Enzyme design. Structure first.
Site, short mmCIF file in Angstrom:
data_model
loop_
_atom_site.label_atom_id
_atom_site.label_comp_id
_atom_site.label_asym_id
_atom_site.label_seq_id
_atom_site.Cartn_x
_atom_site.Cartn_y
_atom_site.Cartn_z
N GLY A 28 7.22 7.08 5.80
CA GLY A 28 6.36 7.83 4.91
C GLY A 28 6.52 9.08 4.27
CB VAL A 34 2.61 6.20 6.09
CG1 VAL A 34 2.42 4.56 5.95
CG2 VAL A 34 1.87 6.57 4.90
CG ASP A 160 -5.18 5.33 -2.91
OD1 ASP A 160 -5.96 4.57 -3.34
OD2 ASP A 160 -5.30 6.15 -2.16
#
Ligand SMILES: CCCCCCCCO[C@@H]1O[C@H](CO)[C@@H](O)[C@H](O)[C@H]1O
Length: 332
Positions: A28, A34, A160
């Protein structure tokens, strides 16, 4: 009851997660970090995002709250949703870290023309998701291929230089008062690129982007020029040499006339005249997918939480309440 957590050093921090989440492994950005994981309770591969510095400042805290609230609200097949949110903290007093869990998405729409039948299916799904977002009075504002995830059954979810190629001309003019059809402009740009295998408006820089847009759709008409409150905008536009809208039929050579018709209705300079998502779903291009019985709308979403100036500990407490009140979606 509180799940048993375990701890493990990942991305330079100690992550602490419920044991249901196994085999954590980094993937991430940082723009929070992430990790990929396998959720054993559900059988799903997931993305687990540990927020970075979620309450470091008022700005960070308000951001964290708004993000959580949005993700909690979104419950639609074509929009990313929240599978889980947790904190290792047993109390507000101990509350420092937030982790968000979503479906691990393997591919996006960046990931070389598509067939017309596949374009139909992908754009149907985007518009079905957009109808839902818009019905909540939310504007995405940054729809682009990298914010569109697909799985191996070509099921799609809206997510998102940060690229300007998909951005509505009024956003690049700093217009404000944006309409929800800023998102429809983006969908047009995406659809055009899926159909042709080429970026529609690959601007090199800010003004070049505008120049490319004006080349296709023509200079503003009289009806649009009447709606320009800016004296400087108005006087600049009037000085441009008058160009007609190009013939989309001879720009998207070979394309389904129903697709070209739809693109003409999306890629209109005047935002008030662009087709809406709900109108687009009824367009004959989508005849094979369109079902009024299953194109659902959202519950109303409260964004006032947003004009407010609160203290860090207030935003933090409000975020904590949202973490504690979270209800996981049905096992499906
Ligand atoms: C030189 C390029 C000019 C681009 C003109 C874009 C006009 C966009 O459309 C406009 O957007 C606004 C925001 O929703 C509205 O308030 C207007 O009613 C509408 O005309």
């Amino acid at each position: 009851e509180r799940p048993t957590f375990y701890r493990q050093e990942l991305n330079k921090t100690i992550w602490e997660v419920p044991e249901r989440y196994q085999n954590l492994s980094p993937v991430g950005s940082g723009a929070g970090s992430v990790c990929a994981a396998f959720d054993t309770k559900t059988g799903l591969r997931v993305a687990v995002k540990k927020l970075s510095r979620p309450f470091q400042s008022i700005i960070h805290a308000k951001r964290t709250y708004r993000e959580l609230r949005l993700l909690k609200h979104m419950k639609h097949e074509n929009v990313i949703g929240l599978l889980d949110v947790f904190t290792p903290a047993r109390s507000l007093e101990e509350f420092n870290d937030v982790y968000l869990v979503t479906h691990l998405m393997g591919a996006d729409l960046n990931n070389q023309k598509l067939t017309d039948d596949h374009v139909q299916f992908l754009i149907y799904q985007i518009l079905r998701g957009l109808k839902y977002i818009h019905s909540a009075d939310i504007i995405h504002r940054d729809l682009k291929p990298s914010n569109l995830a697909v799985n191996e059954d070509c099921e799609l979810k809206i997510l998102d230089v940060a690229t300007r190629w998909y951005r509505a001309p009024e956003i690049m003019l700093n217009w404000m008062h944006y309409n929800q059809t800023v998102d429809i402009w983006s969908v047009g740009c995406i659809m055009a690129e899926l159909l042709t295998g080429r970026t529609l408006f690959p601007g090199t820089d800010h003004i070049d982007q505008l120049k490319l847009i004006l080349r296709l759709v023509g200079t503003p008409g009289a009806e649009l020029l009447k709606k320009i409150s800016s004296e400087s905008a108005r006087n600049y536009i009037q000085s441009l040499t008058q160009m007609p809208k190009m013939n989309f039929a001879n720009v998207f050579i070979g394309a389904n006339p129903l697709a070209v018709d739809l693109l003409e209705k999306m890629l209109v300079l005047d935002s008030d005249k662009r087709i809406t998502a709900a109108q687009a779903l009824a367009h004959a291009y989508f005849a094979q997918y369109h079902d009024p019985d299953d194109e659902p709308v959202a519950d109303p979403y409260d964004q006032s939480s947003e004009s407010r100036d609160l203290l860090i500990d207030e935003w933090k407490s409000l975020t904590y309440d949202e973490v504690i009140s979270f209800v996981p979606p049905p096992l499906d």
